């Protein structure tokens, strides 16, 4: 599976976060910590334009390097979770 | 009422998405329940709002920033001698009881980029708002929210929004579902009662 911007939201749900319960301690919580940053970092990505102190310009630039860095967290749960076994 | 920043579905009306948080609906959903279940200790007497009282609160959430608990009380013409059911602090009456922060966030972004007037009413239809703030909260990037927009908002009006509001958080009902029950609790009926009498 890959993981974007619109994939986004469409994949980090609290039901694929449940189908990792399945996974023991050692490989869920790690699996789940990078799936709960990448949550965070997507939900936080256009706070900067709420922010005045930066420029347009340069808060769009913090934007994609949120939504790519947020992407990229959930790919690699997914990833390392698929491995583990869960499919989604 | 609750909020969460991961997606879910409605427990309600299944097969349908979690309402974000900074919609018009949701926002007007929380803001019902919390003047809805809101009660005054009066003494040793425990009051609920009457109709008039709620009715000089319903509105003034959408037309200042935030209503403090201190507001309300000079709003209600509350004696001293009335309290606060659920207030804890020194200055706990300066917490906010309300702010509907999405409806003062585009409001603010519109009267920002000069396309709109201060003080002025938030000349927008709900479910765009609503929409709007389903669109910020489901995709980051300019060109997936634009995407999504589709042209159902001015394009001035956009350009505006994709330049100072960001929204996150979800509310556990769908907006479908909310569709149903928000109607009912404006007539003062409580989500208890109102959620088993659409669906349950």
């Known amino acids: 599976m890959k993981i974007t911007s619109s994939n986004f939201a469409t994949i980090a749900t609290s039901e694929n976060f449940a189908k990792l319960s399945v996974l023991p301690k050692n490989h869920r ?7 709960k940053s990448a949550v965070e970092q997507f939900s936080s990505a256009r706070d900067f334009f709420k922010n005045e102190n930066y420029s347009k310009e340069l808060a769009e630039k913090f934007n994609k390097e949120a939504v ?3 992407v990229e967290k ?14 989604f | 009422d609750a909020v969460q920043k991961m997606l879910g579905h409605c427990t309600f009306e299944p097969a349908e998405p ?4 900074n919609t018009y609906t949701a926002e007007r959903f929380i803001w019902l329940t919390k003047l809805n279940n809101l009660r005054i200790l009066e003494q040793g007497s425990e009051r609920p709002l009457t109709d008039t009282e709620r009715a000089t609160l319903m509105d003034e959430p959408y037309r200042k920033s935030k209503l403090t608990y201190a507001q309300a009380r000079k709003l ?26 999405a409806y003062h966030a585009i409001s ?3 009267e920002k980029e000069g396309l709109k007037d201060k003080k002025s009413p938030l000349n927008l239809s709900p479910e765009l708002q609503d929409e709007i703030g389903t669109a910020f909260s489901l995709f980051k990037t300019d060109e997936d929210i634009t995407g999504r927009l589709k042209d ?3 394009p001035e009006i956009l350009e505006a929004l994709l330049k100072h509001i960001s929204f996150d958080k979800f ?12 109607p009912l609790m404006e007539q003062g009926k409580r989500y208890d009662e109102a959620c088993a009498e659409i669906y349950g």
């Not at chain 1, 959930?74 to 499919?87: F, M, P, R, V």
């Not at chain 2, 013409?77 to 602090?89: I, V």
């Open chain 1, 74 to 87: 959930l790919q690699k749960a997914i990833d390392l979770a698929e491995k583990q076994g869960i499919q």
């Open chain 1, 68 to 70: 790519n860095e947020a």
């Open chain 1, 29 to 35: 919580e790690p699996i789940k910590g990078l799936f």
């Open chain 2, 18 to 21: 979690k309402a974000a948080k």
């Open chain 2, 171 to 182: 509310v556990q009902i769908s907006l479908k579902a909310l569709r149903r029950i928000v």
């Open chain 2, 108 to 110: 603010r972004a519109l």
């Open chain 2, 152 to 154: 159902r908002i001015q």
């Open chain 2, 76 to 101: 209600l013409g509350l004696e001293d001698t009335a309290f606060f059911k659920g207030l804890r602090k020194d200055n706990a009456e300066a917490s906010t009881l309300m702010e509907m922060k």
